[PDB]
């Protein structure tokens, strides 16, 4: 049985988005419904809750009197509709089932199936492509020893961006990190790769930045200074 | 009015070893208690239903047990599929919110590597938009703890630096650290030496690298 998860974007503070979710397989109407959320570095947190028969709701108090969970037993459809949003309501949403009974011992307090999860970000930040600054490997790097380089993809939004090296052919020893959200409300990350000292003889390195929101392509070649 | 608190924060665990994660309420929750398995990316996935049911599809190496306020998951010994975060979750029927434990963290333990370590200066480019970023990159080191702090001038920087670590490496069971420091461009040729000093206990000392403006 599937819980099928659509809605989530990207909006400004004290803005609406609407999260919806098909039941598949199992009987909707029977079960009540939950919406749970995690936020960037923190734990699973609880929402909300509607009864099987839509008779009865509930609220976390970081929620309450601004979201508004409903259920649609015609169309066996559920909804969180997200109103005066704030950027700490920023998280992946998740809508969940009851768990079953099964003739007494089991319980209807777990939640056994979960949507794939969908993310809504608050922010004040507008649409913004990357620059894309190299880091060049050091005067110092020499054979016999480990040279490392990058990207450093600054001041963009919103997530994601995605990069790769050498149009994909190069895998091995790239760390791509997590963003960091900057005071400025935009994004930052480094793409690095090290590489033996004695390929930098021979072996072009190019970081390829794409950031699809602002439609941004950056190819970065990345060279001794 | 119902608190879980898991631990451990972290579990590290050879593949094959067996653990045990440990998650108490602040009050009797009876046998209603949960466990999920969470990994970046994916939904939450039922592992344990009411304390000890073992939800369907879920390997025997996975076990619930306990009552009351005291409840372990146990692993009878670690898969690499394994790597995750673990949450515990409580409900009852009224008032009818669930609760969450805060997660544990199970991560494959390796031997010691010591972080290979270098600074980048703010590109020429980036200077001629105002702003100079210095990164400094920790590759390939385990544990996970580390410490970057930066020195401008021998000065000790505070409030201007963020830094981000790679989840754990799939072939060697590494993580990776950037930190990148951020001053305005005046700021930045307001000074000459910039350093970064790494504290790991793979590094016999803390390594600090440098250079002139």
């Known amino acids: 049985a599937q819980l099928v998860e659509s809605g989530g974007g990207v909006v400004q503070p004290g803005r609406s988005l609407t999260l919806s979710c098909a039941a598949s397989?199992?009987?909707?109407?029977?079960?009540?419904m939950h919406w749970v959320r995690q936020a960037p570095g923190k734990g699973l947190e609880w929402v909300a809750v509607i009864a099987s028969h839509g008779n009865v709701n509930y609220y976390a108090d970081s929620v309450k009197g601004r979201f508004t969970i409903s259920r649609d037993n015609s169309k066996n459809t559920l909804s969180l509709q997200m109103d005066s949003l704030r950027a700490e309501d920023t998280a992946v949403y998740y809508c969940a089932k009851e768990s079953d009974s099964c003739g007494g011992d089991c319980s209807r307090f777990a939640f056994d199936v979960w949507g794939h999860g969908t993310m809504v970000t608050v922010s004040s930040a507008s649409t913004k492509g990357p620059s894309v600054f190299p880091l060049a490997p050091s005067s110092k790097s020499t054979s016999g020893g480990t040279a490392a380089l990058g990207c450093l993809v600054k001041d963009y939004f919103p997530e994601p961006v995605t990069v790769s090296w050498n149009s994909g052919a190069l895998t091995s020893g790239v760390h791509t990190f997590p963003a960091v959200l900057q005071s400025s409300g935009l994004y930052s990350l480094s793409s690095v790769v090290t590489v033996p000292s004695s390929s930098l003889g021979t072996q072009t390195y190019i970081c390829n930045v794409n950031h699809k929101p602002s439609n941004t392509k950056v190819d970065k070649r990345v060279e001794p200074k | 009015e119902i608190v879980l608190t898991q631990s451990p924060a972290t579990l590290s665990l050879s593949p094959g070893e067996r653990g045990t994660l440990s998650c108490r309420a602040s009050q009797s929750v009876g046998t209603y208690l949960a466990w999920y398995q969470h990994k970046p990316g994916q939904a939450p996935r039922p592992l344990i239903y009411?304390?000890?049911r073992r939800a369907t599809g879920i390997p025997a190496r996975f076990s619930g047990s306990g009552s009351g306020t005291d409840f372990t998951l146990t692993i009878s010994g670690l898969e690499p599929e394994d790597v995750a975060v673990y949450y515990c979750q409580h409900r009852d029927s009224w008032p009818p919110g669930a609760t969450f434990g805060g997660g544990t963290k199970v991560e494959i333990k390796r031997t010691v590597a010591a972080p290979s370590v270098f600074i980048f200066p703010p590109s020429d480019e980036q200077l001629k938009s105002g702003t100079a970023s210095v990164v400094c990159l920790l590759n390939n080191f385990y544990p996970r703890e580390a410490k970057v702090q930066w020195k401008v001038d021998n000065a000790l920087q505070s409030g201007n630096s963020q830094e981000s670590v790679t989840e754990q490496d799939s072939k060697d069971s590494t993580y990776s650290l950037s930190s990148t420091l951020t001053l305005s461009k005046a700021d930045y040729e307001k000074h000459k030496v910039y350093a970064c000093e790494v504290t790991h206990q793979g590094l016999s000392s803390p390594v600090t690298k440098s250079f002139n403006r």
């Open positions: 009411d304390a000890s």
């Open positions: 397989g199992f009987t909707f109407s029977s079960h009540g």
